[PDB]
């Protein structure tokens, strides 16, 4: 229409929603080391995933934000860290790891009492556009018979990694609950792909299961209204 | 252009269809490839093909294309379906870019290892769809028409053509490393015929790429 | 420092905001943009593409999905009703959630415009007959026979044309009904198949558009 | 006190929340904002959402816009 | 070549020529590599072959 | 004071920011800038300088490092393979981490462009012979002999020229292989040393560049 701004592909992708959920309890077994990590899995949520396979070649940026709250929702005087891990850089392995003080890894000091801060990452893919389907082998190496260390994390598709840590030699005094939101500014796609409609079986692999359901069965017969 | 005595009878009244109104491009020829005839049956569910890996065995320059790395050509694909004037049937031809083959993970435990070489190699003849409603990939068959395609009806036509340029995942593309595309043929209305008539419908597909590149590297 | 106090509500965080943030990498240079034959602009042109529609939904077996998307026709039935396509409302369940148009409209709340459909016939070259396309406006009662439907806007099928038969709905915004009826009996020459199957196509017109987004998701 | 509260606008098409742990809270298409109440009160605005051209406080007819005029419709 | 089928018939045919010296043909694929003529039943007898040289 | 509320995330502290701070000394005057013959602009021109490369790595003794950077040649070996330089990938360990080009690329993640190498010979003035330079493209199997390598892009060495022999790699981006083979036997006049030692040089072409920085450090 004349006012078609709300109907464009940007508007069709203009929404900040739930992307990540990571918890850091004071004591427990989910993270007995005081820190956690999160891989960017857009395909994890079938809501946002089902959108992207409508096209095959697509480009998108993103911005990320962090929220710190207690199970009751109170605010406490502590700081938390966030840093982007490029594929070449190594992930942290311990709470006292040397990766925290690495200069080449961008990190920011943030006070959670300050209303939540938000950061953005530009286009990091070495290729021209993202490809959600790679019609070939997951690994880009010359070997096609072994279990290579580069399997799963290929330089041609991965788009980064985040880690969280509370810095300070003194022990943390409060429980933490962390929620993650993301949104895109520039989105551009080239070629449409038929929509994926049937039930999913795996979290990131389009393989499906032998029990067949149809998307609709409401209409009984042609003669029936 | 004959290999000894290869002078087939070809149609001169093809129905010209253009793709997006765009002819192919330069660097970013008269050999007509011949494939084995396909038999269409009443209970048949449709077939599929994968290029360029399977294409490197049928063509005269295709056989040499096994050793050629890059491509630079325009595709004129001819699909031919000859039938009598009193036969019944309907066929769909379409091209699905970046067509990822859907493996089937059955059994009591829903987990499998790296795809077996048996599934990866169906041969140069082609394979049959296990459940053609989802194209054996969980992708609904209702939505193929958004991609380039053509309608083939026995009452209407006997041949069709498709022209598609090179679309790849990278500006610098490898044909022997990256699977480009594939062709899908599936019946929509099952073929019917009178008792005693010919029960086999021939299908032939013809394509004519221009040329490929050798490449090569040393240490 | 400079004397100015912002009105209360400075740190409100709403998703719709047109905010720009400092890049995490202020020195990286993005990869050059290339030209790709594929290109997408809006949702309107994607609605302008043709896709098949389904009518029959009797069988439910896994090896039996195909005869759903098409409906049969036989010469024994005559002067009656072959198939009655369900109510015209793409957003809701029925015929249109199978095609691309309804599903994309599924991500929206309300829409307005005109819709058009085209029909294709898959009979033998030696076959002939007459067919009727019936459209009734919303509000009006259910059609009774070919005569009642013929009063309104109807399309008559001729087998001298293969698929030139098409219908255009002037307006859609409780819901309209369309049905198919036998104007004459089906006659077939001897030595030819006694039955055929029918398929249809649908798309969206130029003036069709959506207004407001909806947070709708079903699986998974 | 140090706590946060949520506010979101529900369009007529969107479904209302039914439980505290409902899936509607994390729905992306429903606009919601994270706000700290220690911050002096924040204010938000909504533009014209009526599908019609202007509002009508009196509808000289039936409350329901459906084709049925005898039942207790959900609308 | 001339064809004497019915008006309602259809099908596909192949004409194979191999140059002297070359081994015997095996199937349609091997012969298709060389100069071959493909028969179309949309044409009645337009199918013809020309041998560039014989000695 | 002036009515405007900044969006949340005002005091985020990221290292990449292009922020300017008030000087601690607002009255000091910096020392005048002088002209120095040395001058540096980017990392590209520093890659455009020549540096030696190493092949042999058999001995490890402290007083034995020098015979690593050069590899020997003898007249007894003929019609075979003298030395096979390791896979072409400057960032990873192998040949190139000894030279300046690989080490500076060590502070980066990915790179693209073309590479060139030049070879120098240190034989006697009275010596003669023939030598072969072999390059195989990535993907292709390992070379077998001089004949297989000769099919691809190869460089033939002539002793009528001292060091005019050079090789250029059109593209590098799993890794390519280069090797040296004996095209003919080594012949030497009587009264001359029976063996010699060989050295080589390497550099980067104009179109060679890096894209993204990496946080890599080894010692200490």
Numbering used by the authors:
A (entry chain A): 72 to 296
B (entry chain B): 7 to 34, 45 to 235
C (entry chain C), F (entry chain C): 1 to 173, 177 to 223
D (entry chain A): 147 to 221
E (entry chain C): 119 to 173
What does the literature reporting this entry say, word for word?
Enteroviruses particles are composed of single-strand RNA (virion RNA) genomes encapsulated by an icosahedral capsid of ~30 nm in diameter. In this study, we genetically perturb this equilibrium in a non-enveloped virus, enterovirus A71 to determine its structural basis. We isolate a single-point mutation variant with increased particle thermotolerance and decreased efficiency of cell entry. Using cryo-electron microscopy and molecular dynamics simulations, we determine that the thermostable native particles have acquired an expanded conformation that results in a significant increase in protein dynamics.
The population of K162E particles containing Coulomb potential, which correspond to viral RNA, at the center of the particle (A-particles) was heterogeneous in nature and composed of at least three distinct structures. The three states (A1, A2, A3) were resolved by 3D class averaging and refinement steps. The proportions of A1, A2, and A3 in the heat-inactivated preparation were 67.4%, 19.4%, and 7.9%, respectively. These structures were resolved at 3.1, 7.4, and 5.9 Å resolution for A1, A2, and A3, respectively. Interestingly, while the most abundant state A1 contained both VP4 and the pocket factor, A2 had lost the pocket factor but retained VP4, and A3 no longer contained pocket factor or VP4. A trajectory of irreversible molecule loss was resolved from the presence of either none, one, or both molecules. These data suggest that the pocket factor must be dislodged prior to VP4 loss, and both molecules must be released prior to complete genome uncoating. We observed a couple of intermediates that suggest that the first step in particle conversion is the release of the pocket factor (A1 particle to A2 particle), followed by large rearrangement of the N-terminus of VP1 and release of VP4 (A2 particle to A3 particle). Finally, virus RNA is expelled generating empty particles (A3 particle to empty particle).
